[PDB]
Design an enzyme around this catalytic site. Structure first.
Site, short mmCIF file in Angstrom:
data_model
loop_
_atom_site.label_atom_id
_atom_site.label_comp_id
_atom_site.label_asym_id
_atom_site.label_seq_id
_atom_site.Cartn_x
_atom_site.Cartn_y
_atom_site.Cartn_z
CB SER A 1 -0.95 0.22 1.38
OG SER A 1 -2.21 0.74 1.48
CD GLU B 1 -5.23 -3.97 -4.74
OE1 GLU B 1 -5.30 -3.25 -3.74
OE2 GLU B 1 -4.25 -5.01 -4.85
CG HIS C 1 -5.87 -2.40 0.22
ND1 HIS C 1 -5.07 -1.51 -1.20
CD2 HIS C 1 -4.75 -1.53 1.45
CE1 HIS C 1 -3.69 -1.44 -1.14
NE2 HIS C 1 -3.58 -0.88 -0.02
#
Ligand SMILES: NC(=O)c1cc[n+](CCCn2ccnc2/C=N/O)cc1
Ligand SMILES: NC(=O)c1cc[n+](CCCn2ccnc2/C=N\O)cc1
Ligand SMILES: [Cl-]
Ligand SMILES: [Cl-]
EC number: 3.1.1.7
Lengths: 540, 540
Positions: free
Chosen positions: B200, B331, B444
């Site tokens: 990330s 995602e 995510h």
């Protein structure tokens, strides 16, 4: 001697001909005049009804083809010569034909009125592929077909002026429909069951008659094959019509001297020119190089068309009407050999990325660079952005979606959502006798020969499966004419052809295989053409 | 006091701790100070190297977490609490941790350096899912994780000023990388095979070191997981950074209400405020309601970043560099339950189309109404334009493509085409212990626990197939760190993971099934984001 071949109509008497089919005879009345010849001072003016005649008019052969351009891109080639005139060219061409079963039906029979295609610049009712003897003999209906004026003679328009008002070719068709009203009963026809049907520019004309009030009361059902009145090629504005008409005059020496000038004296000069002279300059008035665009087409005048066809489809009521609509698999392939770079009839037409980017400019003319970028975005396969075979199919689909499929799907949804019961098809069979190359697939206009039952002609070399396929399609079209429903009424053993609704979007595939219901008429692609691209042009 | 739990580094001595794994012990050195505490007058300034110390620093436990916002949206919920601080909060937080196997390696061992994610506003190296004891034990690696300043403490920037230059959180990561060069040999590590990897905002950070010359000389390989420096959320302009910094100052009573003058008295006021007061107003400075947008992120200052990450990537030489990139299957789903209307963790989130069109304005902030029309066109299924389950899945793909997958795919193509050897994956296994609802898929951040071998912890209820899957992924990551190629070094018996090229675009699916090669990292969708959408906005 047969009393079947001598008929009296409002204007006089006619002598017909009896035709052979593999399964019975049929009476035909080819070459019936329905209007005074639009020659000399009548050129560009609306048609006048034929004055009644004394004696017997011979109606045993087709009359003359309306004066039109003759394609010469591939001389001696079956794929193009089959659409070229098979009679002499003359402005004396306003004649219709009628086919009738033998013996003549004793009860009123449904009537089918055919309007030929040809981009509003060509076409004739005498083409071998429009022979109504097989459809009339097998399904025992009444078939009527006409000639209307094409090109400048039918659609040159100086708006406002009355020497060349415009849309006179559409008025030629309407007069033939009033003729069917006043006269089809003499042939065993029912003036209360009239189904218009046309293809390409004929399908656009059928649609424009749905939207013109004076024509609406002359038919009851409609079949639109590979065309629609809202297509980007089917109409022009009063301003562009005036421009194209003026430059055609300049190219042929009108007006002589100073331009002046009255629309009266410009049309007066156009009326003195030989017909072939206007035809030789018809293609020089197109603003840009483009495929699927034609010089003289119906104009939005305020008389025949109250507004743009897209406007009248939205603000209209279509209750009590049934419409059959459909397209072929590869609508855009036929038009790519008429100007698109890299395309040839005689090779595989494996275009490069550069040629694809140039062909988009020809296939979608008058677009901002940004709008061109969006088309390239939606039709590129970015996993193989340079596969020539995939670029070939993409440009074919670009032309097909932009001009035929999506304008049709636009019109089909708005009809069911506003009253009409709509059935939809996609013709997917490629005739074994097709002379075009393999990569063109099922091109524009090559379902007509099956609808008219041409494969039943013994001289042709069609296969036995296609003959059965021909009668099956002739059954569908005739059932729609009688019942307003292509499904066999007394038959629950056959696959059902469900109506097309604005939400479910159901259609069927016409093929040698039995019916197969599908959903979505290029739904993902046509959302770009019908919803997003308009707004992308309202940017600037 | 074992002989290997005492290490001398440049700054002094350290005492480590011996940890247990189900298959052997591991030496750990948790809480090593690598910088002077950035407190008082040092707040907002670049880090200073840690002054050498006398005696023995205790490195047996994790140090404090940097001051950061704590998520209180779902209190007591495992899915969110696993990312929340597990130590006390303090500005005294610049500490790193080193895991090394037992007994210490005899030859120089490759080093993995982990940079945690958290949108540049949260995260800590002490989280349970970043425990490197299972990785270094199974693959005999040296793992190093540090803390860096997040939020306004790490990324508040008044560009031009020297009191708050910005990007100091990135400088914290670099100073920790310089520490690894000067000291990892004392733990058995090779400072000539250092592999960065983050997820990330950590992946975005790993990417920004590739584009900063002073940092590129401190590592040799890179792994970017669900992030990229060119993502729309990873940077801001100098003008926007100033606006956010001064609005935060206003909300906490700075400048001394009220004499708005130079940046010196502004930062001087911000330095007197308690740390918790700055954090309590972090989210109030965002311009608009948005998902996947963060207040204080790195800034393009011309120093650390001479140009935008997009610019530095296109004009960069990456020969001799190995890069591993990848994304998870879903995602965007994680970010929808924070700002998107109609979305809830505790129901099916079956939004209506009205809510889908509102979420597009929240998932793609600050685009023209025409640009929003394009997104709606591309992600709508025009056969089911109102299916709630499809609109839910489509909005997840909008946020995912816009922020993660397509910024990654753009970076991956440019790296391979400009010298770098690139491998790519898509993580598709939803862990059996996952607490988020079923409709979120593989959200995510939920590949990290498998990369770190967390399923090998016996106290956790992972299945037997998932333990084996963990060791598989741990091998790929270790093989990449050792060799630069994730495939087993001399193994034709196992399936082959091919590189990623701009033309073929090949990647693998990481799942309980063996490797499956695929082509196209959301190729059609990303062409809209990477190619067309920039042109649509540069035409205001
Ligand atoms: N106090 C608030 O009104 C508040 C607003 C937004 N947030 C953002 C949630 C944090 N987050 C986690 C993953 N992605 C995000 C933010 N997306 O915009 C938190 C609190
Ligand atoms: N002499 C010329 O340059 C010429 C140009 C265009 N044409 C039009 C060909 C006819 N046509 C058939 C299908 N589509 C078209 C025209 N545009 O697509 C013919 C000749
Ligand atoms: Cl045609
Ligand atoms: Cl996260």
């Amino acid at each position: 001697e047969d009393a079947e071949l001598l008929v009296t109509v409002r204007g006089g008497r006619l002598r017909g001909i009896r035709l052979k089919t593999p399964g019975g005879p049929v009476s035909a009345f080819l070459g019936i005049p329905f209007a005074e010849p639009p020659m000399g001072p009548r050129r560009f003016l609306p048609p006048e009804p034929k004055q009644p005649w004394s004696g017997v008019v011979d109606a045993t052969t087709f009359q003359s083809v309306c004066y039109q351009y003759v394609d010469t891109l591939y001389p001696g080639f079956e794929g193009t010569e089959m659409w070229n005139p098979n009679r002499e060219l003359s402005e004396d061409c306003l004649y219709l034909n009628v086919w009738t079963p033998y013996p003549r039906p004793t009860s009123p029979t449904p009537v089918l009125v055919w309007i030929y295609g040809g981009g509003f610049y060509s076409g004739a009712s005498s083409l071998d592929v429009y022979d109504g003897r097989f459809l009339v003999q097998a399904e025992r209906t009444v078939l009527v077909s006409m000639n209307y004026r094409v090109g400048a003679f039918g659609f040159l328009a100086l708006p406002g002026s009355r020497e060349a008002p415009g849309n006179v070719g559409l008025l030629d068709q309407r007069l033939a429909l009033q003729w069917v009203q006043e006269n089809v009963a003499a042939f065993g026809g029912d003036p209360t069951s009239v189904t218009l049907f046309g293809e390409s520019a004929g399908a656009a004309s059928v649609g424009m008659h749905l939207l013109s009030p004076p024509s609406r009361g002359l038919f009851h059902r409609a079949v639109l094959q590979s065309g629609a009145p809202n297509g980007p090629w089917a109409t022009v504005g009063m301003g562009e019509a005036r421009r194209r008409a003026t430059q055609l005059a300049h190219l042929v020496g009108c007006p002589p001297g100073g331009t002046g000038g009255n629309d009266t004296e410009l049309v007066a000069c156009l009326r003195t020119r030989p017909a072939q002279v206007l035809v030789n300059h018809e293609w020089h008035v197109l603003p840009q190089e483009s495929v699927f665009r034609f010089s003289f087409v119906p104009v939005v005048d305020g008389d025949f068309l109250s507004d743009t066809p897209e406007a009248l489809i939205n603000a209209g009521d279509f209750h009590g009407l049934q419409v059959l609509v459909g397209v072929v698999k590869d609508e855009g392939s036929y038009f790519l050999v008429y100007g698109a770079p890299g395309f040839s009839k005689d090779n595989e037409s494996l275009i490069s990325r550069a040629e694809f980017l140039a062909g988009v400019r020809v296939g979608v003319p008058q677009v901002s660079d940004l709008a061109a970028e969006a088309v390239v975005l939606h039709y590129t396969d970015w996993l193989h952005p340079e596969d020539p075979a995939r670029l070939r199919e993409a440009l074919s689909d670009v032309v097909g979606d932009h001009n035929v499929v999506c304008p049709v799907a636009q019109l089909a949804g708005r009809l069911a959502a506003q009253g009409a019961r709509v059935y939809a098809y996609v013709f997917e069979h490629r005739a074994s006798t097709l002379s075009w190359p393999l990569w063109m697939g099922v091109p524009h206009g090559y379902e007509i020969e099956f609808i008219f039952g041409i494969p039943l002609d013994p001289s042709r070399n069609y296969t036995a499966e296609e003959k059965i396929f021909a009668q099956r399609l002739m059954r569908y079209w005739a059932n729609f004419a009688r019942t307003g429903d292509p499904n066999e009424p007394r038959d629950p053993k056959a696959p059902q052809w469900p109506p097309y609704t604005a939400g479910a979007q159901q259609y069927v595939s016409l093929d040698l295989r039995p019916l197969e219901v599908r959903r979505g008429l290029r739904a993902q692609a046509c959302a770009f053409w019908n919803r997003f691209l308009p707004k992308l042009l309202s940017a600037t």
